[PDB]
């Protein structure tokens, strides 16, 4: 059910991502999955023309994080806090790309 | 799922296209539009447009040349609300 989110594009290279992003612009981003190893997701993010990319952490009690302050129970919690207030990302999570 | 919707070449020549959208009820501050050859992993172009308008012209287009045109309505809840900005590719 992550896949109905708009922001998740599911398994995704890195360089997959820079080019979903292109079309973007600031706070343009998606949330992808390895292509390599499964259950393993970061977060691409547009900024000022280049693009970021950020691992979704885990921590050791199972919470999500990419800033370790602000640690979240579900990954679409942690998109939603983060569409918010930047904290820790270069800018906020604002126009999920389209999907291609 | 996106916003805005109907996102539609109105009428073209091989350098230049009329856009048209249909916006959302809830009011956007304006539109931001990005176009560029599809499959460019950089060189797009972006504009804007008031959030009281639903069409533009981008002009200075290559014929032949398959564009990705895509509107974000700045500032709109695309998060809060699941859904996401709207974009077409067209050729010429």
Not at chain 1, 33 to 42: K, V
Not at chain 1, 67 to 90: K, M, P, Y
Not at chain 2, 39 to 66: H, M, N, R
Request: charge should be neutral; avoid cysteine.
């Amino acid at each position: 059910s992550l896949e109905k989110h708009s922001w998740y594009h599911g398994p995704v290279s890195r360089n997959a991502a820079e080019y979903l992003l292109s079309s973007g612009i600031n706070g343009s981003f998606l949330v992808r999955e390895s292509e390599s190893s499964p259950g393993q997701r970061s977060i691409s993010l547009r900024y000022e023309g280049r693009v970021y990319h950020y691992r979704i952490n885990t921590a050791s009690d199972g919470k999500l994080y990419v800033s370790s302050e602000s640690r979240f129970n579900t990954l679409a919690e942690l998109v939603h806090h983060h569409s918010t207030v930047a904290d820790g990302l270069i800018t906020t999570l604002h126009y999920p790309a389209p999907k291609r | 799922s996106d916003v805005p919707t109907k996102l539609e070449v109105v009428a073209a020549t091989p350098t230049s296209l009329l856009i048209s959208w249909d916006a959302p009820a809830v009011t956007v501050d304006y539109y931001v539009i990005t176009y560029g050859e599809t499959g460019g992993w950089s060189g797009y172009q972006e504009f804007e447009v008031p959030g009281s308008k639903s069409t533009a012209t981008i002009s200075g287009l290559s014929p032949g040349v398959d564009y990705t045109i895509t509107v974000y309505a700045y500032g709109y809840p695309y998060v809060k609300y699941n859904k996401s900005p709207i974009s077409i590719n067209y050729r010429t």
